[PDB]
Design a protein around this ligand. Structure first.
Ligand SMILES: Cc1cc2nc3c(=O)[nH]c(=O)nc-3n(C[C@H](O)[C@H](O)[C@H](O)COP(=O)(O)O)c2cc1C
Ligand SMILES: Cc1c([N+](=O)[O-])cc([N+](=O)[O-])cc1[N+](=O)[O-]
Length: 349
């Protein structure tokens, strides 16, 4: 098996195993509404086996960056519908990544309110993009009932994604955002049904997953994880146990895939997760053509997601097939505004 062999995820046939990783780019219109610029960008990348969209918030309290899109209202659904129609006409496939940033936010995005979280534990560091430099606030610990409200927002978010014509949704369970905050022991000190045991810590992620399953069918839902717990001040007392529990439970549900941001190293627990899950496993982080093909050949992966290389290379699959040069990425325009560093990376000549 190579990157260029087709794969099915659930009942969706992909033409290859080169996946576009989810990538926040902050190019949405005011009101967090997807636009024609975003449609153009995704269409340029439609040769990807599957596109995983930029993280998209399921409620106004789940945002923490400027100009990132939402999926909670009709205006946003309409904007996304133009994206998915254009991707589909271009012969591509796309899933919406459902987001809630939890404590990784700033009151300036939340009309002065505090970011919410499983527990009132301040994340270290500075808020990305915010100027002048600012620490994160200490978040407000959610009430038990408010967590059910969040589940309902993911449910409505998944329904809205379906109305917007996506091929499926991916739950953002990774990178220290809300669901990950609940999942891990350092950030979750709750003593209700949502903390204080592994079953309880994983509960919110599985409840959101089940809601998405009611709307889509499990074979059109994926989940994103970050098993090294290395972004946004995370940490868990037994991550081998925590992430394989999740993998096992998601596998029981027959979900379409798990995608893990976890570069290859001796301590990679990807193989334990893959085995416990039993379905298609998408690896990610610092892979290139050679190491991706090696992972497919060894059975460590069923497909491989590329992030920065897809930012810089709209026709990454053709470039990889041809062992062609790759455009150099410009991290200074990963975020920010407009078409420069967004839709102006050239295709192969
Ligand atoms: C600019 C940028 C935006 C990203 N946005 C998201 C995101 O919205 N959701 C997510 O799960 N990961 C996001 N990531 C992480 C990537 O999906 C991926 O895990 C990471 O870039 C490593 O893979 P790579 O080495 O192939 O780039 C982002 C990464 C970058 C550089
Ligand atoms: C490394 C990283 C993030 N971070 O700030 O540490 C955030 C991401 N995100 O989803 O916004 C993704 C990241 N990543 O996967 O490289």
């Amino acid at each position: 098996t190579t990157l260029f062999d087709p794969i099915k995820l659930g009942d969706l046939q992909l033409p290859n195993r080169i996946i576009m990783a989810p990538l926040t780019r902050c190019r949405a219109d005011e009101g967090r509404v997807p636009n024609a610029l975003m449609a153009e960008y995704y269409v340029q990348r439609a040769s990807a086996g599957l596109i995983l969209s930029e993280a998209t918030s399921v409620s106004p309290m789940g945002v923490g960056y400027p100009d990132t899109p939402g999926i909670w209202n009709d205006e946003q659904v309409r904007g996304w519908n133009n994206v998915t129609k254009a991707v589909h006409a271009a012969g591509g496939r796309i899933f919406l990544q459902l987001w809630h940033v939890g404590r990784i936010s700033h009151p300036s995005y939340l009309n002065g309110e505090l970011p919410v979280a499983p527990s009132a534990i301040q994340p270290k560091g500075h808020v990305s993009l915010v100027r002048p430099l600012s620490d994160y606030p200490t978040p407000r610990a959610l009430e038990t009932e408010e967590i059910n409200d969040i589940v309902e927002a993911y449910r409505s978010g998944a329904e809205n994604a379906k109305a917007a014509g996506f091929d499926g949704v991916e739950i953002h369970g990774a990178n220290g955002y809300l669901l990950d905050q609940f999942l891990q022991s350092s950030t979750n000190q709750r003593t209700d049904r949502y903390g204080g045991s592994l079953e309880n810590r994983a509960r919110l992620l599985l409840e959101v997953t089940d809601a998405a399953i009611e709307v889509w069918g499990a074979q059109r839902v994926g989940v994103h994880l970050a098993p090294r717990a290395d972004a946004h001040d995370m940490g868990d007392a037994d991550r081998a146990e925590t992430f394989t529990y999740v993998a096992r439970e998601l596998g029981k549900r027959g979900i379409a895939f798990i995608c893990s941001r976890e570069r290859e190293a001796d301590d990679s627990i990807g193989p334990l997760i893959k085995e416990a899950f039993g379905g298609p496993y998408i690896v990610n982080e610092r892979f290139d053509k050679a190491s991706a093909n090696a992972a497919l050949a060894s059975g460590k992966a069923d497909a491989v997601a590329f992030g920065v290389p897809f930012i810089a290379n709209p026709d990454l699959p053709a470039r990889l097939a041809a062992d062609a040069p790759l455009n150099e990425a410009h991290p200074e325009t990963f975020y920010g505004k407009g078409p420069v560093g967004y839709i102006d990376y050239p295709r192969l000549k």
